[PDB]
Design a protein around this nucleic acid. Structure first.
Ligand SMILES: [K+]
Ligand SMILES: [K+]
Ligand SMILES: [K+]
Ligand SMILES: [K+]
Ligand SMILES: [K+]
Ligand SMILES: [K+]
Ligand SMILES: [K+]
Ligand SMILES: [K+]
Ligand SMILES: [K+]
Ligand SMILES: [K+]
Ligand SMILES: [K+]
Ligand SMILES: [K+]
Ligand SMILES: [K+]
Ligand SMILES: [K+]
Ligand SMILES: [Mg+2]
Ligand SMILES: [Mg+2]
Ligand SMILES: [Mg+2]
Ligand SMILES: [Mg+2]
Ligand SMILES: [Mg+2]
Ligand SMILES: [Mg+2]
Ligand SMILES: [Mg+2]
Ligand SMILES: [Mg+2]
Ligand SMILES: [Mg+2]
Ligand SMILES: [Mg+2]
Ligand SMILES: [Mg+2]
Ligand SMILES: [Mg+2]
Ligand SMILES: [Mg+2]
Ligand SMILES: [Mg+2]
Ligand SMILES: [Mg+2]
Ligand SMILES: [Mg+2]
Ligand SMILES: [Mg+2]
Ligand SMILES: [Mg+2]
Ligand SMILES: [Mg+2]
Ligand SMILES: [Mg+2]
Ligand SMILES: [Mg+2]
Ligand SMILES: [Mg+2]
Ligand SMILES: [Mg+2]
Ligand SMILES: [Mg+2]
Ligand SMILES: [Mg+2]
Ligand SMILES: [Mg+2]
Ligand SMILES: [Mg+2]
Ligand SMILES: [Mg+2]
Ligand SMILES: [Mg+2]
Ligand SMILES: [Mg+2]
Ligand SMILES: [Mg+2]
Ligand SMILES: [Mg+2]
Ligand SMILES: [Mg+2]
Ligand SMILES: [Mg+2]
Ligand SMILES: [Mg+2]
Ligand SMILES: [Mg+2]
Ligand SMILES: [Mg+2]
Lengths: 133, 129, 121
RNA sequence: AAAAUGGCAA
RNA sequence: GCUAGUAGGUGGGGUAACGGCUCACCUAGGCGACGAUCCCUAGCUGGUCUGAGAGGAUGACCAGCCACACUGGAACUGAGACACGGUCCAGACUCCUACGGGAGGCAGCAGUGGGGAAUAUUGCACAAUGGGCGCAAGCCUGAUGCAGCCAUGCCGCGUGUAUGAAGAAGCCCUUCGGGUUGUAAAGUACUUUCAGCGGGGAGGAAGGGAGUAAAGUUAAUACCUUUGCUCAUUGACGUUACCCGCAGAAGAAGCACCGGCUAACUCCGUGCCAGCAGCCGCGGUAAUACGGAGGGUGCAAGCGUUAAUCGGAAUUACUGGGCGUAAAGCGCACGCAGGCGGUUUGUUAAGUCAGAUGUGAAAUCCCCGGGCUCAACCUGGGAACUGCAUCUGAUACUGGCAAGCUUGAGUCUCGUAGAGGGGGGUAGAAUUCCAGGUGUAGCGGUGAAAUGCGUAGAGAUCUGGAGGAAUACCGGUGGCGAAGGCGGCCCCCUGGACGAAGACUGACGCUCAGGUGCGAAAGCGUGGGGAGCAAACAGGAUUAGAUACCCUGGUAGUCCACGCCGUAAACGAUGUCGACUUGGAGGUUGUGCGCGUGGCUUCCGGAGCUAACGCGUUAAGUCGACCGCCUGGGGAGUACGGCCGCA
RNA sequence: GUACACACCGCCCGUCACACCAUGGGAGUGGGUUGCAAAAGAAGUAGGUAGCUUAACCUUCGGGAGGGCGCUUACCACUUUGUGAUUCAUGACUGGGGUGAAGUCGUAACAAGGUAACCGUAGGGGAACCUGCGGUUGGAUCA
């Protein structure tokens, strides 16, 4: 973390010297992305950062944006147990690029309508955080 | 013990006035007599008398104007624990001048007004309203 | 207390320590946000309240509250903090100032603009 | 004779 | 606790001068609970802010004093320095170098980098004031006078002003009738500060330099000086203040707030979300509290927010609070220092009081005035500076000294009651144990049981013995003791209290930090003792469990001597001593003559007091002296350090 | 009587589990500051003089006086060493405390809270607690 602070300062100074060099921290990943006109251009700047500013850092290709999906369909029951909550949801894989689809198929008030938005919110939050990586 | 005699005199008057006692009697002393004269001259007490030689006793005759004590309150300003001395300009005023303050000036014990007229400051013995 | 006793030992006033230690008698102090996170309020209040851990120039690290709707603050952002404790948030004794340093004014604010560092339309 | 407990709520 | 030049003395040296200033010698001092020493923090003051005041906080600007000049140290020169822009040395830093050696010090002014939430231009002039040097002229002056930057503050002024219903549109609200914005705007008639453009124009300027005159001076109408006289001349600010003219409402309003506190309200969106918030709290689908809009309130070139100080806070209470139960009476007592002390006379004048004098810088503050168009601002005079020293008076009160007195306190004579204390002795009842006799199957225990005990004869009954412990009845809201406590009877040693009538002493008193003593039970040490009881422990029950309640047993301990501990709801949850202030019914113990008068004590209750409950002559009423103690709840009477303890 | 007031279906204590916060201890460790016992000795100042040298004065004209320099001594800055004190920071681990969340185990108090409660003390127990001894009323009941 100490090297991060030194790195930030080093990056600023290098950016001041070279406007074609762009260094910015990805807010999502927390990774610092460096942009340059060449691989050597970046390598020099990294080397400068290590030698001039004594900053130990590891340089790699930026992680690509990744998304998860389901391959198979399944019916699952989520029960929370006073505090009580019981839901039965069927997950099916959608066509590529079709996006997310939620269907409320509750009939006869098996689940109160007041709690349906809560179920949706729970699903949506969990989906955003993913299941694998 | 009786470390302050004067306080006892004032207390006896106050307690006597509360109890609707016609007269209050205490062991006489020169200062007590002097304070009594001031009260009589200001009309707070009707009359005072001293009896006995070896052991004189001062009797103060209390007065009630309308079945109510003429002396509404009497308080010892200067005490053995803490003595209070005032310059002539700093002499106290009681009840916006309606009350009297007994001051021991060099010439003698006198009301605050009398001392202020004289232009001599003194120790403030008590406030009587 | 008798006079003689008071002469021997005088009456003493309370220490009356301040409730904003980190500021150290400074109207504002500057700090870098080590972490920005949301914390739940104490009862009986329910919300997600945005807070940041800021290491000040004085060197004290204190939780500070990011007021208004929305924030651009992330780790390593430089902000200016002012005194002011959040009742329902324990350990929050400071507020971040919108419109100072890296902190940006609240968007779509047409009232109390000075408080939320929003320039006049 | 023995005889426990009823989250915090408005 | 501290201190050996330490404290003092003698002599010598030393300084401008006194002096352990220094040195030798001599003596053993000096200092401190009125806080030494040590630690932490800090320039001080006149003043500033706040406050009705007393206080509290503070010491930027201006002025007085002090210390410092890269760090550490030393001296030289000089009237004066141990010296910002001097010297020498050492060190850290920066710089130069031919590597041998050298140079430098913005906490002067401006300025840069850095640090920070944050604080100005590498300006002009020496015109004025003041300073250095000079006979003077003059020269020097980042002092100083001015300018620049900054809403940082204070003050003043502007952003128009009359008219204007069309009650326009438009906005918001609406019960769709209307209401509100709002005479607000348009429309119309005026005014032009200030800004802008133009033209005029003070004052800060005194003096100095030329001459010229007289006088003084002198040998001299010389020269020099002095005072007049005359002639040019000196202004950074500066495009000065100000005046005047010109055009035209033109060029000039924002910020915070509207649940209550707190003046100012609805609508819509949102839905314990997003959010708000000093406090109280608000938000889960009818939010005057969130966000926005209309409308309003408060302020205005400012308005909010944050930080900081005082106030409100009588919430450290001197002014000006408290301590039965809210936080707060040491467990109780003795007592040193300290605080306080009956009555009379003389004396003194310390305190106190009066007057006077010197002083208490100026500024500031306050009052009355004056000057800038006003104000801020500048300024004259007065007041005030509450203090301190000295001198001269007064003598009530306080104090000192001296002499008294008896009234407080105490001593003696006599008698009374008492579980007052210490020591030795003894009696009776009971329990337990042991032995013997009689006698036979249960006993014991519980809500019910069981464990246990008994045919190796229990339990029950009788007889004898042993041992320990506590003393039925009397017995009492009874008594005694400072408190803790103290209970059969007897002797011995010893303390206190009260009553009666006299004598005697003469204020010999009261409170009491520190200190010291005593101080239930439990506990600890050493040596004894051990009936009953009984933490622990064991078994039996109970129970969901039962580390308990209950049952059967049982060890320490309980008892004694000595030593330690030092604490309890050690409670009246009420410190000690003194005085005063209606009543009633009782107890106990004196005493005088049924009626008095003392000591102690119980219950009730009046006034008064109290938040109330209550207290109520045994005050929690009314006062005085002195001490202890308290300042929201937790954390916590805990941690750490010290002291003490065998633990 | 009451510690209850959506009123005993009330209220409410502690251990244990988990997260977090402040804090105490801890083999120690590293900074700051400082006490004491020593060491050290630039420059300067004063004292003495192995020696060297000398405008103003004196002189018998040789020299003398006096001075400078050098050396030396005293004092003293930097610096150095040993051994303590104090303060700050950190430390495997650990003690007690606080704050959540609808965890777990009980039910200690508040009614006579179902063994009245509580105080001091000692012993015991997962925990609240339980038990003995003495004390207090700030316990209910009494027909
Ligand atoms: K809420
Ligand atoms: K001497
Ligand atoms: K000395
Ligand atoms: K210095
Ligand atoms: K000048
Ligand atoms: K007081
Ligand atoms: K005494
Ligand atoms: K006297
Ligand atoms: K036993
Ligand atoms: K009442
Ligand atoms: K810890
Ligand atoms: K440590
Ligand atoms: K119990
Ligand atoms: K106990
Ligand atoms: Mg300082
Ligand atoms: Mg006040
Ligand atoms: Mg000299
Ligand atoms: Mg100089
Ligand atoms: Mg300089
Ligand atoms: Mg400067
Ligand atoms: Mg900066
Ligand atoms: Mg020059
Ligand atoms: Mg209102
Ligand atoms: Mg709504
Ligand atoms: Mg106050
Ligand atoms: Mg109070
Ligand atoms: Mg209590
Ligand atoms: Mg209490
Ligand atoms: Mg007591
Ligand atoms: Mg006098
Ligand atoms: Mg003055
Ligand atoms: Mg006298
Ligand atoms: Mg008694
Ligand atoms: Mg006796
Ligand atoms: Mg005992
Ligand atoms: Mg024993
Ligand atoms: Mg037994
Ligand atoms: Mg038993
Ligand atoms: Mg105690
Ligand atoms: Mg007792
Ligand atoms: Mg007590
Ligand atoms: Mg006493
Ligand atoms: Mg009563
Ligand atoms: Mg303790
Ligand atoms: Mg301790
Ligand atoms: Mg630690
Ligand atoms: Mg030397
Ligand atoms: Mg219970
Ligand atoms: Mg119970
Ligand atoms: Mg109870
Ligand atoms: Mg037990």
């Amino acid at each position: 973390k100490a090297d991060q602070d030194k790195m930030t300062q080093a990056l600023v100074k290098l950016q001041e010297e070279d406007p074609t060099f762009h260094a910015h921290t990805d807010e999502e990943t927390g990774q610092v992305i460096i942009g340059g006109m060449g691989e050597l251009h970046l390598d020099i700047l990294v080397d400068r950062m290590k030698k001039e500013f004594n900053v130990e850092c590891n340089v790699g290709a930026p992680m690509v944006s990744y998304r998860e999906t389901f391959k198979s369909s399944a019916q699952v029951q989520g029960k929370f147990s006073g505090q009580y909550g019981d839901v039965h949801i069927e997950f099916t894989p959608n066509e590529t690029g079709a996006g997310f689809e939620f269907e409320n198929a509750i009939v006869g008030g098996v689940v109160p309508r007041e709690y349906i938005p809560s179920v949706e919110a729970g699903l949506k939050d969990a989906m955003e955080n993913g299941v694998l990586a | 013990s009786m470390q302050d005699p004067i306080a006892d005199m004032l207390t006896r008057i106050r307690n006597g006035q509360a109890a609707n006692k016609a007269a209050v009697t205490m062991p006489s002393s020169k200062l007590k007599v002097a304070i009594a004269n001031v009260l009589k001259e200001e009309g707070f007490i009707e009359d005072f008398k001293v009896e006995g030689d070896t052991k004189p006793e001062l009797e103060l005759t209390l007065k009630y104007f309308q079945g109510k004590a003429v002396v509404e309150s009497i308080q010892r300003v200067s005490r053995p624990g803490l003595r209070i001395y005032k310059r002539k300009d700093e002499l106290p005023k009681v009840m916006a001048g309606l009350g009297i303050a007994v001051v021991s000036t060099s010439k003698g014990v006198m009301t605050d007004r009398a001392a202020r007229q004289a232009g001599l400051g003194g120790e403030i013995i008590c406030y009587v309203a | 207390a008798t006079v003689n006793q008071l002469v021997r030992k005088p009456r003493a006033r309370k220490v009356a320590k301040s409730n904003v230690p980190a500021l150290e008698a400074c109207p504002q102090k500057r700090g870098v946000c080590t972490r920005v996170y949301t914390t739940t309020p104490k009862k009986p209040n329910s919300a997600l309240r945005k807070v940041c851990r800021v290491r000040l120039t004085n060197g004290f690290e204190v939780t500070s509250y990011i007021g208004g709707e929305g924030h651009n603050l992330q780790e390593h952002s430089v902000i200016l903090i002012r005194g002011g404790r959040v009742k329902d948030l324990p350990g929050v004794r400071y507020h971040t100032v919108r419109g100072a340093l890296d902190c940006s004014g609240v968007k779509d604010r047409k009232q109390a603009r000075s408080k939320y560092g929003v320039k006049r339309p």
